[PDB]
Write a protein that binds this DNA or RNA. Structure first.
Ligand code: MG
Ligand code: MG
Ligand code: MG
Ligand code: MG
Ligand code: MG
Ligand code: MG
Ligand code: MG
Ligand code: MG
Ligand code: MG
Ligand code: MG
Ligand code: MG
Ligand code: MG
Ligand code: MG
Ligand code: MG
Ligand code: MG
Ligand code: MG
Lengths: 126, 151, 215, 102, 82, 100, 100
RNA sequence: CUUACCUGGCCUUGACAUACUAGAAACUUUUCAGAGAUGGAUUGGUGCCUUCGGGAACCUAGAUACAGGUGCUGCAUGGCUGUCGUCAGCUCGUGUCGUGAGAUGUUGGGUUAAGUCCCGCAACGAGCGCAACCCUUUUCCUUACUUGCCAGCAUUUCGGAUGGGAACUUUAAGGAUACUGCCAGUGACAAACUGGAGGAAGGCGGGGACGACGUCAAGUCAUCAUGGCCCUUACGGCCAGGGCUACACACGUGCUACAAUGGUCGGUACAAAGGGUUGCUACACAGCGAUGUGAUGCUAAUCUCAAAAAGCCGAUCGUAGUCCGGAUUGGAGUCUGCAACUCGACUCCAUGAAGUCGGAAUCGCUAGUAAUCGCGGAUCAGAAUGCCGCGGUGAAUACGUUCCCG
């Protein structure tokens, strides 16, 4: 019913939220099936345990791009924005948590004359 | 640096025990960004140590950490062309960091089959009071005690 | 140290390319080589007509060369016969037929290329280099440029030791990408070798970006 | 200390020159020993295929254990003269640096 | 190695010289520059001089050599020791 | 049922946008309905060119060329619309493909 | 490059153009299954007997303006030395400096 | 081949330009000699314009100026490039001061990343540098509904597949936003600096281009141009083989390992950027495999390269020179190419080297960075551990400037 968009490290998540028993689906899959790593599940779940109203909502989630951590961050951001859209009074607590902010860190490009973005070849003085 | 005051980053609490201290310890254990294997190692060690005696793993870890934390260190001061190792107090963050580094290095130099087993052995040894981290704590106390004379 | 090409740094900013056509990845090389050939031909043919720019365009199965000249009379021809020969040569060079157009230059002393050729002519005829430099600078500033800069390097006066000498007046903000700077280079072949001439002319700051240029 | 000597096309180099340079340089700088780990000398002729009073450039660059690498140049009319000038300048420079750092 | 389906490679002129030699009975060496040809089974018992860069070296072809290329018996470098 | 597909390729997005705007305006004058312009992924081609004549590997110039594509459909076209599209002139730098 | 080098390149291209058709026909005969084994062998012999310069593998790309055999950059057809000059004069359409 | 080097066989107005004379369309089919360059035979056509009595193309033959040079000089040069060094500086006009070289301005206080800014002052004014204008990334709005997308509907051989929709993701142009804007403090009541509210983002948000006046007779006559010297039946030109890959040794930059934070086997998830018509190829068969045959869709947000790998779940290995490591060698093959001997890439069977963590010394890096994991491209018939890009997981530590350097 209430929609949210989340973004993190090339990953984008579309989140639909509607009052329900506590269902949670990701790409026609469950949280345990999609994320085999516990940190990702914890990150996905933080926003709704933060309000102590985890099982009073139902979520329908799609995600594309990035890796497991980026997708988890995007899903959490989408859930946070969906909550803010649903209720205005949620935004101060969610921001105090820090979920309202959108992380802008991204990979830095390789550079001419350098092995990597910052790393440069060896200059021996033996 | 010569300017600015860089702020500290935030380490999220671990999944199982929700401990920032345990998360920082996992970060010390981690290599090449393999944090999942880091958590596996740390949790296996914690289960192994819990098996020996029935206590809270978090409480055991923090007690052993307090056992192993340093008190006093010297920082080399170059005046008059001499070392002049001067004892000084150290901030809690440095205390915790050196304690964790000593624990992990001692575990690495132990001689069990797996990192989890040897980390658990090191935690037990530190709890008892005889270990390589305990020896480094003793040595730093000994040296800062020999050089107490200077301010 | 070294410096970026004043035109090269502003292609998509305040300037436009000297060639405007589209090609598929296969015919691109042929088009570029033939454009270079036609430019080489025109430079030799119109040496004495004070030509400033050549714009090569391929609209569709045809060609369009726009020649910017201070002396349109010579290129046009007294009775217009010269333009027919020019288009014939262009159609011979390029597979599709080419049409020529002429842009008359009414303020030649604001064009960097023309100034460089003028200085190079005197330098080849053995006039004093810092006489020609000052004459060109004064003429351009009288024309109205906000600034001009001239550089001459080589064996000036026949000296065994080569050297470089320059003179600047007004404003030449090279680091400002929104500034109209015209850059030109020319060569003078004297009995004692080559002398290089560089000219910069500044025509104020362009406003509104490439949209104002109507790209 | 390991010695790595190089010349240019004009100068002309040989293993005999390598042995002689290594021997002389070690003999002169034998005192420092462990203080220094690497020498590299380089030889050039500037206006190759012509002549002059100097017309040859010698360089020696040495790495002292600890402090940063230090370099010395000399110009002379002959390879032997260039080498001797560079050796003298290196000796003076190293003496000054070691006296400074004590 | 050359694919079997293509078959062995031999130069036309060398092949023709070999057939002339075998059809006749003459032991005069066959001078050639084709180091890239293969020693066919019909080459046995013939003397073939192969260019090695500055001179032609003889090779008396025996049953062992079949399958090698001609150049494998005419080394091109002169090294005697350091 | 006839539908006309129009594909524009250029090296200058401003020129290609001008061309597409002119095409849609021409269609509107005739009175047909048109979908677009639809942006299509831009191609980028990047090249590394050494700037020193002899030896400096780290001193280079990095150049790029971009290909911009635009898509247009015109549906329910009339005999006057098609003739207007054919009559319309073409500017350089924008290669236009018309498919029936 | 030298004019002799350029002329050698040109004659090689001319020979390849001359013999392309026969070379292709012989290769097709070689790759044809329904053809007889003796015919395939004869095709192989003729292909091996063709002149060497007919083989496209013996052609080297060259700048065209200068004939340099390195840094060719197929798309433009110019070696880096002249490509940089032509680009930064503004005579190559669509090419600009890259910053991303 | 590239190729500029060497052995040998060859040509001399030259492989390429202009100028003079004469005959021939240009071209075209076959063999013969030879390593080839070359030479000697042998077929078919006789074209395009003409005040047709002569001309354009493209050859042949002779003659003379000449061509030709990757031959020397970067210390005779143009053009281009490195470095001090994105260091914050470097200079002019009018005035003044001093016999003059010269000085001021550009110095003094705070301050900034900065000759950045505010106060004073025989200085008043300017230019080149700093910053800004340019590209990219983070939030949102409008236009656009394709080939790309699927929230509400329905049909489904349950595959957005279908009828459909224009919501969302995305795609790619144009706009908005962030200015110490507001609050509480500090400082001369100046610049400016701290702590806060709001916001996706708060005090240059993070990267990229952009190289001041000048320095080192710094680098490049072998990209190219060019003054001056040199060779002219050879220092020019064509060709076949060989070499640039040699091997008592010494250095620089890398890749792979020395294992259990791991190796092997089975199952199972999640990318971004590029390439494809002389090419990428779904799918079936044959093969242990590299591959081959048939065949399909693609000039591409449509078909394809394509399998992402680290990761997660299950089993074994249980500290051994090992179920670690994969150099070297012996057999058997595939492919590209006229041709893999010198001297190619890859596949299978067998073999199983040094290595068990590396002297003195010394290098890179302050955050989506280091470390680690895989993917693409230019060059290119084939031939990357190199170079240029892309994304996945993801740290440690900064008390401080005392001693180290610039
Ligand atoms: Mg990376
Ligand atoms: Mg990027
Ligand atoms: Mg020099
Ligand atoms: Mg084999
Ligand atoms: Mg030449
Ligand atoms: Mg090739
Ligand atoms: Mg060769
Ligand atoms: Mg120089
Ligand atoms: Mg030199
Ligand atoms: Mg700037
Ligand atoms: Mg040279
Ligand atoms: Mg050869
Ligand atoms: Mg080599
Ligand atoms: Mg193994
Ligand atoms: Mg051993
Ligand atoms: Mg390749």
């Amino acid at each position: 019913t209430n929609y949210g968009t989340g973004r993190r490290k090339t990953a984008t998540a579309r989140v639909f939220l509607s009052a329900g028993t506590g269902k949670l689906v990701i790409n026609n899959r469950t949280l345990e099936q999609y994320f085999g790593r516990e940190t990702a599940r914890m990150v996905v779940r933080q926003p709704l345990e933060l309000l102590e109203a985890t099982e009073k909502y139902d979520l329908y989630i799609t995600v594309k791009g990035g890796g497991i951590g980026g997708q988890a961050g995007a899903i959490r951001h989408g859930i946070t924005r969906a909550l803010i859209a649903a209720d205005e009074t949620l935004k101060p607590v969610l921001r105090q948590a820090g979920f309202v902010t959108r992380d802008a860190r991204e990979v830095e490009r390789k550079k001419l004359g350098l092995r990597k973005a910052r790393k440069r070849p060896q200059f021996s003085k033996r | 640096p010569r300017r600015r005051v860089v702020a500290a980053r935030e380490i999220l609490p671990d999944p199982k025990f929700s401990s920032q201290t345990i998360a920082k310890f996992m970060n010390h254990v981690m290599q090449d960004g393999k944090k999942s294997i880091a958590e596996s190692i740390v949790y296996g060690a914690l289960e192994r140590v819990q098996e020996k005696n029935k206590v809270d793993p978090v409480e055991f870890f923090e007690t052993t950490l307090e056992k192993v934390r340093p008190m006093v260190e010297v920082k080399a001061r170059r005046v008059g062309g001499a070392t002049y190792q001067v004892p000084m107090e150290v901030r809690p963050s440095r205390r915790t960091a050196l304690a964790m580094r000593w624990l992990v290095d001692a575990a690495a130099k132990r001689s069990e089959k797996t990192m989890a087993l040897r980390l658990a052995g090191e935690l037990l040894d530190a709890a008892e009071g005889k270990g390589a981290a305990i020896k480094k704590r003793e040595d730093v106390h000994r040296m800062a005690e020999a050089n107490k004379a200077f301010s | 140290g070294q410096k970026v090409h004043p035109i090269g740094i502003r292609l998509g900013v305040v300037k436009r390319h000297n060639a405007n056509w589209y090609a598929n990845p296969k015919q691109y090389a042929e088009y570029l080589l033939k454009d270079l050939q036609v430019r080489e031909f025109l430079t030799k043919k119109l040496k004495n007509a004070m030509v400033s720019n050549i714009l090569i365009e391929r609209p569709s199965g045809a060609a369009k060369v726009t020649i910017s000249t201070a002396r349109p009379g010579i290129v046009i021809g007294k009775k217009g016969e010269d333009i027919e020969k020019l288009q014939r040569e262009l159609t011979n060079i390029m597979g599709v037929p080419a049409q020529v157009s002429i842009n008359e230059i009414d303020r030649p002393d604001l064009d960097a290329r023309l100034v460089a050729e003028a200085i190079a002519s005197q330098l080849e005829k053995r006039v004093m280099f810092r006489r020609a430099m000052k004459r060109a600078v004064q003429n351009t500033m009288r024309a109205g440029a906000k600034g001009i800069k001239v550089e001459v390097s080589g064996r000036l006066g026949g000296a065994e030791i080569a050297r470089t000498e320059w003179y600047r007046e007004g404003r030449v903000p090279l680091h400002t990408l929104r500034a109209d700077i015209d850059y030109a280079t020319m060569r003078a072949e004297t009995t004692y070798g080559t002398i290089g001439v560089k000219v910069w002319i500044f025509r104020g700051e362009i406003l509104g970006g490439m949209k104002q240029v109507m790209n | 200390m390991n010695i790595e000597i190089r010349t240019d096309k004009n100068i002309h180099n040989s293993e005999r020159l390598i042995t002689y340079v290594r021997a002389e340089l070690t003999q002169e700088f034998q005192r420092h020993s462990e203080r220094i780990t690497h020498f590299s000398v380089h030889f050039s002729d500037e206006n190759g295929d012509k002549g002059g009073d100097k017309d040859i450039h010698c360089m020696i660059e040495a790495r002292p254990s600890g402090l940063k690498p230090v370099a010395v140049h000399h110009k002379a009319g002959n390879i032997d003269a260039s080498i001797h000038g560079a050796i003298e300048k290196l000796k003076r420079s190293l003496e000054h640096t070691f006296e400074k750092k004590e | 190695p050359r694919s079997l389906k293509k078959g062995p490679f031999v130069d036309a002129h060398l092949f023709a010289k070999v057939e002339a030699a075998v059809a006749s009975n003459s032991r005069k060496p066959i001078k050639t520059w084709s180091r890239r040809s293969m020693i066919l089974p019909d080459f046995v018992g013939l003397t073939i001089s192969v260019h090695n860069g500055r001179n032609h070296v003889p090779v008396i072809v025996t049953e062992h050599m079949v399958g090698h290329k001609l150049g494998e018996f005419a080394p091109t470098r002169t090294y005697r020791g350091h | 049922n006839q539908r006309i597909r129009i594909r524009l390729k250029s090296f200058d997005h401003r020129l290609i946008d001008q061309s597409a705007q002119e095409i849609v305006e021409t269609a509107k004058r005739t009175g047909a309905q048109v979908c677009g312009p639809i942006p299509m992924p831009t191609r980028i081609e990047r090249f590394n060119v050494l700037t020193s004549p002899h030896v400096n590997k780290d001193a280079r110039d990095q150049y790029e060329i971009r290909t911009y594509k635009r898509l247009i459909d015109i549906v329910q076209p009339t005999d006057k619309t098609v003739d207007a599209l054919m009559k319309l002139d073409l500017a350089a730098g924008v290669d236009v493909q018309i498919a029936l | 490059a030298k004019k002799g080098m350029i002329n050698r390149e040109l004659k090689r291209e001319k020979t390849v153009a001359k013999y392309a058709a026969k070379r292709a026909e012989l290769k097709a005969t070689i790759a044809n299954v329904n053809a007889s084994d003796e015919e395939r062998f004869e095709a192989m012999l003729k292909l091996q007997a063709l002149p060497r310069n007919a083989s496209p593998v013996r052609l080297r790309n060259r700048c065209g303006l200068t004939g340099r055999p390195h840094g060719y950059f197929r798309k433009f057809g110019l070696s880096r030395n002249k490509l940089r000059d032509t680009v930064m004069q503004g005579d190559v359409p669509g090419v600009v400096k890259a910053s991303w």
